[PDB]
mmCIF file of N, CA, C and O in Angstrom:
data_model
loop_
_atom_site.group_PDB
_atom_site.id
_atom_site.type_symbol
_atom_site.label_atom_id
_atom_site.label_comp_id
_atom_site.label_asym_id
_atom_site.label_seq_id
_atom_site.Cartn_x
_atom_site.Cartn_y
_atom_site.Cartn_z
ATOM 1 N N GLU A 13 106.537 121.382 93.791
ATOM 2 C CA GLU A 13 106.540 123.209 93.440
ATOM 3 C C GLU A 13 105.065 123.903 94.128
ATOM 4 O O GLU A 13 104.986 123.410 95.315
ATOM 5 N N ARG A 14 104.577 124.661 93.141
ATOM 6 C CA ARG A 14 103.064 124.936 93.984
ATOM 7 C C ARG A 14 101.980 123.703 94.655
ATOM 8 O O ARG A 14 102.222 123.008 94.864
ATOM 9 N N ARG A 15 102.161 124.485 95.941
ATOM 10 C CA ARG A 15 101.102 123.690 96.826
ATOM 11 C C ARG A 15 100.465 124.110 97.913
ATOM 12 O O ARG A 15 100.270 125.510 97.489
ATOM 13 N N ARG A 16 100.003 123.417 99.110
ATOM 14 C CA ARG A 16 99.269 124.222 100.221
ATOM 15 C C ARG A 16 98.002 124.934 99.426
ATOM 16 O O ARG A 16 97.482 125.980 99.688
ATOM 17 N N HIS A 17 97.392 123.927 98.450
ATOM 18 C CA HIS A 17 95.770 124.267 98.039
ATOM 19 C C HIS A 17 94.907 123.711 99.091
ATOM 20 O O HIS A 17 93.644 124.054 98.647
ATOM 21 N N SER A 18 95.278 122.950 100.153
ATOM 22 C CA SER A 18 93.767 122.091 100.864
ATOM 23 C C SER A 18 94.552 121.654 102.231
ATOM 24 O O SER A 18 96.129 121.086 102.046
ATOM 25 N N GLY A 19 93.872 121.451 103.133
ATOM 26 C CA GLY A 19 94.447 120.607 104.505
ATOM 27 C C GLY A 19 94.342 119.409 104.617
ATOM 28 O O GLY A 19 95.042 118.304 104.143
ATOM 29 N N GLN A 20 93.251 118.666 104.329
ATOM 30 C CA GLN A 20 92.217 117.412 104.282
ATOM 31 C C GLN A 20 92.704 116.942 103.284
ATOM 32 O O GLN A 20 93.427 117.492 102.595
ATOM 33 N N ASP A 21 93.378 115.517 103.727
ATOM 34 C CA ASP A 21 93.653 114.675 102.108
ATOM 35 C C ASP A 21 93.107 113.262 102.342
ATOM 36 O O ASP A 21 92.364 112.686 102.964
ATOM 37 N N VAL A 22 93.017 112.875 100.994
ATOM 38 C CA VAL A 22 92.733 111.713 100.676
ATOM 39 C C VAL A 22 93.297 110.242 101.145
ATOM 40 O O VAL A 22 94.255 109.779 100.161
ATOM 41 N N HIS A 23 93.037 109.798 101.959
ATOM 42 C CA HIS A 23 93.806 108.612 102.487
ATOM 43 C C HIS A 23 93.379 107.588 103.227
ATOM 44 O O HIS A 23 92.441 107.479 103.341
ATOM 45 N N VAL A 24 93.538 106.191 102.502
ATOM 46 C CA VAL A 24 93.019 105.007 102.459
ATOM 47 C C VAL A 24 93.916 103.632 103.099
ATOM 48 O O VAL A 24 95.177 104.188 102.519
ATOM 49 N N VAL A 25 93.565 102.638 103.556
ATOM 50 C CA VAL A 25 94.179 101.450 103.779
ATOM 51 C C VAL A 25 93.500 100.281 103.213
ATOM 52 O O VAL A 25 92.571 99.926 103.574
ATOM 53 N N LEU A 26 93.986 99.620 102.064
ATOM 54 C CA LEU A 26 93.263 98.462 101.433
ATOM 55 C C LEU A 26 94.303 97.274 101.502
ATOM 56 O O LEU A 26 95.028 97.164 101.046
ATOM 57 N N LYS A 27 93.707 96.221 102.444
ATOM 58 C CA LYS A 27 94.504 95.071 102.300
ATOM 59 C C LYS A 27 93.900 93.696 101.313
ATOM 60 O O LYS A 27 92.905 93.900 100.484
ATOM 61 N N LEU A 28 95.005 93.276 100.737
ATOM 62 C CA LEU A 28 94.589 92.386 99.437
ATOM 63 C C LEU A 28 94.785 90.849 100.399
ATOM 64 O O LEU A 28 95.714 90.101 100.249
ATOM 65 N N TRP A 29 93.239 90.071 100.370
ATOM 66 C CA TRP A 29 93.467 88.974 100.437
ATOM 67 C C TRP A 29 93.848 87.328 99.304
ATOM 68 O O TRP A 29 93.577 88.305 98.249
ATOM 69 N N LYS A 30 94.034 86.564 99.339
ATOM 70 C CA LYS A 30 94.235 85.467 98.515
ATOM 71 C C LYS A 30 93.540 85.728 96.954
ATOM 72 O O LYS A 30 94.038 85.773 95.849
ATOM 73 N N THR A 31 92.039 86.358 97.177
ATOM 74 C CA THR A 31 91.181 86.597 96.193
ATOM 75 C C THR A 31 90.424 87.618 96.433
ATOM 76 O O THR A 31 89.258 87.886 95.782
ATOM 77 N N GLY A 32 90.577 88.319 97.445
ATOM 78 C CA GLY A 32 89.799 89.650 97.774
ATOM 79 C C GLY A 32 90.241 90.673 98.377
ATOM 80 O O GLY A 32 91.916 90.125 99.190
ATOM 81 N N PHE A 33 90.021 91.953 98.585
ATOM 82 C CA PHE A 33 90.687 92.674 99.236
ATOM 83 C C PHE A 33 89.906 93.702 99.792
ATOM 84 O O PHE A 33 88.308 93.945 99.832
ATOM 85 N N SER A 34 90.210 94.042 100.911
ATOM 86 C CA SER A 34 89.733 95.004 102.310
ATOM 87 C C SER A 34 90.195 96.417 101.914
ATOM 88 O O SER A 34 90.790 96.655 101.381
ATOM 89 N N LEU A 35 89.434 97.173 102.871
ATOM 90 C CA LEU A 35 89.301 98.568 102.817
ATOM 91 C C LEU A 35 88.713 99.528 104.259
ATOM 92 O O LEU A 35 88.082 99.697 104.501
ATOM 93 N N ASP A 36 89.922 99.703 105.011
ATOM 94 C CA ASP A 36 89.416 100.045 106.411
ATOM 95 C C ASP A 36 88.353 98.848 107.031
ATOM 96 O O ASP A 36 88.163 98.216 106.982
ATOM 97 N N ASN A 37 87.873 99.804 107.857
ATOM 98 C CA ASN A 37 86.762 98.872 108.628
ATOM 99 C C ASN A 37 86.014 98.117 107.753
ATOM 100 O O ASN A 37 85.119 97.085 108.184
ATOM 101 N N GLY A 38 85.464 98.571 106.797
ATOM 102 C CA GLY A 38 84.544 98.164 105.338
ATOM 103 C C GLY A 38 84.873 96.790 105.423
ATOM 104 O O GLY A 38 86.092 95.898 105.818
ATOM 105 N N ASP A 39 83.934 96.135 104.853
ATOM 106 C CA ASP A 39 84.123 94.539 104.980
ATOM 107 C C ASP A 39 85.225 93.831 103.468
ATOM 108 O O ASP A 39 85.656 94.890 103.138
ATOM 109 N N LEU A 40 85.395 92.722 103.822
ATOM 110 C CA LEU A 40 85.843 92.416 102.531
ATOM 111 C C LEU A 40 85.530 92.545 101.224
ATOM 112 O O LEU A 40 84.267 92.031 101.093
ATOM 113 N N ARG A 41 86.440 92.943 100.310
ATOM 114 C CA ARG A 41 85.709 93.113 98.898
ATOM 115 C C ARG A 41 85.831 92.014 98.006
ATOM 116 O O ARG A 41 87.333 91.289 98.120
ATOM 117 N N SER A 42 85.086 91.532 96.745
ATOM 118 C CA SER A 42 85.464 90.371 96.205
ATOM 119 C C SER A 42 86.564 90.797 94.966
ATOM 120 O O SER A 42 85.899 91.747 94.441
ATOM 121 N N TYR A 43 87.530 90.547 94.869
ATOM 122 C CA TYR A 43 88.382 90.893 93.560
ATOM 123 C C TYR A 43 87.569 90.816 92.383
ATOM 124 O O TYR A 43 87.826 91.787 91.464
ATOM 125 N N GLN A 44 86.491 90.109 92.407
ATOM 126 C CA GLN A 44 85.405 90.200 91.081
ATOM 127 C C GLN A 44 84.009 91.142 91.453
ATOM 128 O O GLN A 44 83.215 91.501 90.915
ATOM 129 N N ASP A 45 83.813 91.699 92.596
ATOM 130 C CA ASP A 45 82.645 92.327 93.171
ATOM 131 C C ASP A 45 82.735 93.571 92.442
ATOM 132 O O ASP A 45 82.960 94.095 91.461
ATOM 133 N N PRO A 46 82.005 94.422 93.000
ATOM 134 C CA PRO A 46 81.620 95.661 92.408
ATOM 135 C C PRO A 46 82.362 96.907 92.997
ATOM 136 O O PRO A 46 82.919 97.277 92.052
ATOM 137 N N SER A 47 82.541 96.868 94.031
ATOM 138 C CA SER A 47 83.592 98.205 94.527
ATOM 139 C C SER A 47 84.741 97.784 93.897
ATOM 140 O O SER A 47 85.723 98.565 94.006
ATOM 141 N N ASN A 48 85.259 96.659 93.688
ATOM 142 C CA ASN A 48 86.533 96.406 93.118
ATOM 143 C C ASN A 48 86.601 97.155 91.632
ATOM 144 O O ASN A 48 87.784 96.906 91.347
ATOM 145 N N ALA A 49 85.994 97.791 91.497
ATOM 146 C CA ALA A 49 85.955 98.484 89.566
ATOM 147 C C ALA A 49 87.035 99.489 90.111
ATOM 148 O O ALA A 49 87.882 99.417 89.361
ATOM 149 N N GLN A 50 86.370 100.338 90.994
ATOM 150 C CA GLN A 50 87.684 101.413 91.005
ATOM 151 C C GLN A 50 88.936 100.954 91.873
ATOM 152 O O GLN A 50 89.891 101.458 91.840
ATOM 153 N N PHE A 51 88.757 100.011 92.756
ATOM 154 C CA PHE A 51 90.198 99.390 93.689
ATOM 155 C C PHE A 51 90.630 99.212 92.731
ATOM 156 O O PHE A 51 91.744 99.268 92.656
ATOM 157 N N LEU A 52 90.412 97.595 92.268
ATOM 158 C CA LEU A 52 91.296 97.105 90.803
ATOM 159 C C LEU A 52 92.062 98.369 89.918
ATOM 160 O O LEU A 52 93.275 98.235 89.658
ATOM 161 N N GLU A 53 91.335 99.082 89.337
ATOM 162 C CA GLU A 53 92.022 99.869 88.597
ATOM 163 C C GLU A 53 92.537 101.396 89.369
ATOM 164 O O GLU A 53 93.808 101.372 89.079
ATOM 165 N N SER A 54 92.137 101.780 90.344
ATOM 166 C CA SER A 54 92.906 102.481 91.023
ATOM 167 C C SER A 54 93.700 101.754 92.124
ATOM 168 O O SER A 54 94.926 102.132 91.847
ATOM 169 N N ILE A 55 93.605 101.013 93.153
ATOM 170 C CA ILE A 55 94.526 99.957 93.597
ATOM 171 C C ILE A 55 95.598 100.173 92.583
ATOM 172 O O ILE A 55 96.771 100.344 92.943
ATOM 173 N N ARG A 56 95.477 99.156 91.295
ATOM 174 C CA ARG A 56 96.472 98.973 90.739
ATOM 175 C C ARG A 56 97.313 100.513 90.302
ATOM 176 O O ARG A 56 98.775 100.008 90.313
ATOM 177 N N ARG A 57 96.576 101.486 90.226
ATOM 178 C CA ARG A 57 97.429 102.565 89.706
ATOM 179 C C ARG A 57 97.927 102.981 90.785
ATOM 180 O O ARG A 57 99.065 103.787 91.099
ATOM 181 N N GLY A 58 97.223 103.168 92.239
ATOM 182 C CA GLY A 58 97.567 103.795 93.167
ATOM 183 C C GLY A 58 96.622 104.739 93.977
ATOM 184 O O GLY A 58 96.487 105.802 94.371
ATOM 185 N N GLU A 59 95.538 103.882 93.703
ATOM 186 C CA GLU A 59 94.476 104.698 94.215
ATOM 187 C C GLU A 59 93.159 104.136 94.960
ATOM 188 O O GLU A 59 93.167 102.769 94.558
ATOM 189 N N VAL A 60 92.224 104.439 95.864
ATOM 190 C CA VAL A 60 91.780 103.673 96.906
ATOM 191 C C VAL A 60 89.817 103.834 96.181
ATOM 192 O O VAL A 60 89.839 104.619 95.709
ATOM 193 N N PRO A 61 89.188 102.652 95.970
ATOM 194 C CA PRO A 61 87.781 102.357 95.384
ATOM 195 C C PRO A 61 87.243 103.678 96.012
ATOM 196 O O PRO A 61 86.306 104.092 95.726
ATOM 197 N N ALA A 62 87.095 104.029 97.623
ATOM 198 C CA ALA A 62 85.803 104.567 98.232
ATOM 199 C C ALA A 62 86.584 105.985 98.651
ATOM 200 O O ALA A 62 86.096 107.137 97.989
ATOM 201 N N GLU A 63 87.727 106.068 99.362
ATOM 202 C CA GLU A 63 88.522 107.370 99.595
ATOM 203 C C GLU A 63 88.425 108.073 98.214
ATOM 204 O O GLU A 63 88.382 109.382 98.804
ATOM 205 N N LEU A 64 89.034 107.639 97.297
ATOM 206 C CA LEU A 64 89.003 108.444 96.123
ATOM 207 C C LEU A 64 87.874 109.229 95.551
ATOM 208 O O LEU A 64 87.996 109.933 94.875
ATOM 209 N N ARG A 65 86.751 108.320 96.102
ATOM 210 C CA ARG A 65 85.647 108.666 95.025
ATOM 211 C C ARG A 65 85.293 110.122 96.201
ATOM 212 O O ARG A 65 84.483 111.254 95.454
ATOM 213 N N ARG A 66 85.645 109.987 97.393
ATOM 214 C CA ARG A 66 85.356 111.580 98.247
ATOM 215 C C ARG A 66 85.937 112.235 97.649
ATOM 216 O O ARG A 66 85.425 113.519 97.271
ATOM 217 N N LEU A 67 87.408 112.218 97.807
ATOM 218 C CA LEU A 67 88.435 112.857 97.417
ATOM 219 C C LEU A 67 88.710 113.526 96.009
ATOM 220 O O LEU A 67 88.624 113.879 94.944
ATOM 221 N N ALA A 68 89.564 112.060 95.567
ATOM 222 C CA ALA A 68 90.037 111.853 94.305
ATOM 223 C C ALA A 68 89.125 112.212 93.017
ATOM 224 O O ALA A 68 89.138 113.155 92.382
ATOM 225 N N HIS A 69 87.763 111.407 93.287
ATOM 226 C CA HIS A 69 86.594 111.626 92.137
ATOM 227 C C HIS A 69 87.235 111.343 91.117
ATOM 228 O O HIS A 69 86.940 112.274 89.922
ATOM 229 N N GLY A 70 87.427 109.875 90.551
ATOM 230 C CA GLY A 70 88.001 109.545 89.624
ATOM 231 C C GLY A 70 88.805 108.577 89.334
ATOM 232 O O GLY A 70 88.458 107.413 89.045
ATOM 233 N N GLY A 71 90.254 108.315 90.305
ATOM 234 C CA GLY A 71 90.757 107.586 90.441
ATOM 235 C C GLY A 71 92.303 107.601 90.850
ATOM 236 O O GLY A 71 93.114 107.462 90.391
ATOM 237 N N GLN A 72 92.870 108.316 92.100
ATOM 238 C CA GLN A 72 93.679 108.976 92.510
ATOM 239 C C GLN A 72 93.574 109.084 93.942
ATOM 240 O O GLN A 72 93.046 110.244 94.608
ATOM 241 N N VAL A 73 94.063 108.124 94.588
ATOM 242 C CA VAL A 73 94.256 108.590 96.076
ATOM 243 C C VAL A 73 95.448 107.608 96.733
ATOM 244 O O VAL A 73 96.052 106.726 96.116
ATOM 245 N N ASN A 74 95.904 108.081 97.648
ATOM 246 C CA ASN A 74 97.229 107.636 98.527
ATOM 247 C C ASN A 74 96.718 106.511 99.590
ATOM 248 O O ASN A 74 96.008 106.662 100.323
ATOM 249 N N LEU A 75 96.833 105.031 98.890
ATOM 250 C CA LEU A 75 96.523 104.158 99.939
ATOM 251 C C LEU A 75 97.591 102.954 100.137
ATOM 252 O O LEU A 75 98.483 102.982 99.845
ATOM 253 N N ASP A 76 97.686 102.481 101.441
ATOM 254 C CA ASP A 76 98.630 101.332 101.827
ATOM 255 C C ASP A 76 98.169 99.850 101.775
ATOM 256 O O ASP A 76 97.374 99.485 102.431
ATOM 257 N N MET A 77 98.746 99.118 100.778
ATOM 258 C CA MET A 77 98.617 97.638 100.626
ATOM 259 C C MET A 77 99.264 97.568 101.969
ATOM 260 O O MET A 77 100.006 96.756 101.700
ATOM 261 N N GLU A 78 98.502 96.487 102.373
ATOM 262 C CA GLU A 78 98.573 95.912 103.458
ATOM 263 C C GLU A 78 99.246 94.090 102.865
ATOM 264 O O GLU A 78 98.056 93.652 102.310
ATOM 265 N N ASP A 79 100.118 93.803 103.057
ATOM 266 C CA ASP A 79 100.581 92.644 102.339
ATOM 267 C C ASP A 79 99.957 91.261 103.339
ATOM 268 O O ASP A 79 100.754 90.860 104.551
ATOM 269 N N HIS A 80 99.149 90.882 102.970
ATOM 270 C CA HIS A 80 98.657 89.243 103.734
ATOM 271 C C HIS A 80 97.875 88.152 102.732
ATOM 272 O O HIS A 80 96.841 88.110 103.224
ATOM 273 N N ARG A 81 98.329 87.738 101.947
ATOM 274 C CA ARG A 81 97.995 86.922 100.856
ATOM 275 C C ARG A 81 97.755 85.537 101.770
ATOM 276 O O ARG A 81 96.742 85.101 102.003
ATOM 277 N N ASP A 82 99.126 85.054 102.030
ATOM 278 C CA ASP A 82 98.885 83.442 102.666
ATOM 279 C C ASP A 82 98.462 83.348 104.166
ATOM 280 O O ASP A 82 99.016 82.880 104.771
ATOM 281 N N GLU A 83 98.327 84.676 104.329
ATOM 282 C CA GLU A 83 98.374 85.025 105.905
ATOM 283 C C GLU A 83 96.842 85.700 106.108
ATOM 284 O O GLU A 83 95.997 85.554 107.355
ATOM 285 N N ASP A 84 96.036 85.908 105.329
ATOM 286 C CA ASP A 84 94.778 86.133 105.500
ATOM 287 C C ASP A 84 93.515 86.064 104.425
ATOM 288 O O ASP A 84 93.931 85.693 103.373
ATOM 289 N N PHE A 85 92.656 85.791 104.947
ATOM 290 C CA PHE A 85 91.291 85.169 103.974
ATOM 291 C C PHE A 85 92.279 84.101 103.345
ATOM 292 O O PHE A 85 92.108 83.990 102.001
ATOM 293 N N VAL A 86 92.179 82.896 104.124
ATOM 294 C CA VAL A 86 92.775 81.978 103.237
ATOM 295 C C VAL A 86 91.688 80.913 102.344
ATOM 296 O O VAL A 86 91.354 79.846 103.114
ATOM 297 N N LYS A 87 91.160 81.145 101.397
ATOM 298 C CA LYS A 87 89.792 80.617 100.403
ATOM 299 C C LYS A 87 90.427 79.187 100.412
ATOM 300 O O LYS A 87 89.663 78.282 100.853
ATOM 301 N N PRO A 88 91.629 78.811 100.275
ATOM 302 C CA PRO A 88 92.197 77.455 100.008
ATOM 303 C C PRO A 88 92.541 76.661 101.337
ATOM 304 O O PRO A 88 93.887 77.069 102.193
#
């Protein structure tokens, strides 16, 4: 319906490691770290912890979850 309200958009990519999740060049975040506050909350609903704070401003952003559990950050 109604649209065309802005050009730029809030997009980001967060990968999920065995027990940690990353996001863009940023380093790997700890599922229990701080940034995981909006990541776990937003990523769970569908928003990025950083790019959403820039545009979303609460917890709403389009992110791409990279599938790499048994292939990335193998804690075990």
